[PDB]
């Protein structure tokens, strides 16, 4: 029956284009993530509401609310009633895994006559004292592709610092590079471990010289 079978093909060829176009949609779908977006708003709002704990303290589960000193933030011993201060997701070492690279635009408004340029924070190394887990000590490389007299230049420096789970803060100070570089400071308050809000500051006053919103670079 050459017709019903040779035509049942023009039917299949369709599914071929369909299945293909369908691939494109699954690609569009991965970009619009809900469970992620919602998290951005949660964090975005919690930032306004503000943890009900004093500076340098960790707020626990929205049900059994209670304050914990970040010296226990994530130390290995159940300190909160809900143990939220040891919940894996709070202490994902991956946020600042050695090799992670964060880029973004650094808009200056405080201590330098710089044109909106880009900064590239990249974690060099990361130790975690087995007898004091509450902190991830780390070294990193800060580069700044900015334009000066003439063409494209690169003002970079090596940094040392730490990551605090409690506040998801990453502090990077210059490795005594006597060239006077502004310590960078990032907070990963955005609902994920991919994006962070940073500022260049004076190690002393912590005065904010510039705003820098970084994003973790894709490895593909």
């Amino acid at each position: 029956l050459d017709p019903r079978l040779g035509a049942n093909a023009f039917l299949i060829i369709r599914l071929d284009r369909i299945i293909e176009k369908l691939r494109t949609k699954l690609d569009e779908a991965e970009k619009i993530d809900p469970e992620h977006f919602v998290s951005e708003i949660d964090a975005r709002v919690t930032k306004i509401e503000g943890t009900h704990c004093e500076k340098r303290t960790f707020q626990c589960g929205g049900n059994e609310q209670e304050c914990i000193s970040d010296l226990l933030v994530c130390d290995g011993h159940k300190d909160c009633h809900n143990a939220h201060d040891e919940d894996p997701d709070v202490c994902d070492t991956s946020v600042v895994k050695a090799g992670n690279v964060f880029s973004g635009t650094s808009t200056w408004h405080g201590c330098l006559a710089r044109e909106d340029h880009v900064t590239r924070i990249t974690i060099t190394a990361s130790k975690r004292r087995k007898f004091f887990t509450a902190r991830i000590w780390l070294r990193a490389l800060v580069e700044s592709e900015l334009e000066r007299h003439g063409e494209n230049v690169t003002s970079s420096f090596n940094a040392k610092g730490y990551y605090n789970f409690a506040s998801r803060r990453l502090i990077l100070l210059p490795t005594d590079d006597h060239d006077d570089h502004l310590a960078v400071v990032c907070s990963f308050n955005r609902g994920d471990n991919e994006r962070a809000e940073c500022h260049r500051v004076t190690e002393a006053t912590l005065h904010q010289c510039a705003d820098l919103f970084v994003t973790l670079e894709e490895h593909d």
């Binding site: 050695a98 060099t124 190394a125 975690r128 004292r129 087995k130």
Partner: protein, 215 residues
Amino acid sequence: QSHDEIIDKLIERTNKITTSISHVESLLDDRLDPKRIRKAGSLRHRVEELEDPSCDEHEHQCGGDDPQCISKLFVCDGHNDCRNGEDEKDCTLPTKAGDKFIGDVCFDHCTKRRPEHMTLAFESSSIAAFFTPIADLHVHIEIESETDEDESEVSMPADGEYSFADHRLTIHPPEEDGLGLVGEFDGYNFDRFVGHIVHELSEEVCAEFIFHRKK
């Protein structure tokens, strides 16, 4: 037995040969098996290394049944400098962007972590249009350490070049401790190279790792 059996005999015979044919095409392919070539050529190299140098310090040997020494600055430059052409027919870059190589330690007298392994990720690689003999690379040297007092991870980035001249990639010192990596390729392999960690200044070897291409 006529237009039926005499037609299926001039067919069952067409195949009876189509077999003997591909049968040989196999035995042939078996002696051209490229995997055998490199594997053997690789062996040749090991020997070339034991023999007195074929050419001066800074010259490239073109091999063949009639040898010719040309400057290493000519290997893969775009000009046919060697009679045979070697200096220009094998210019494929092994460690190219995206590639990853896992090194297994076997002699470590200097690294700060005296690690068991050591991953070598190649971020970028670009060749200057006018100087083909050298390809510049950007690499991240990853390391998974773990002691009693702590547990560190590292991903030091470093610049480096690959010289088709002698299949040797030099990775400039990552940390300011005067320690750099120098892996010289087999010549025919490209999925495994011995990686020597040295003091750039001196050129002292103090760490050997066998790097395998993570495929």
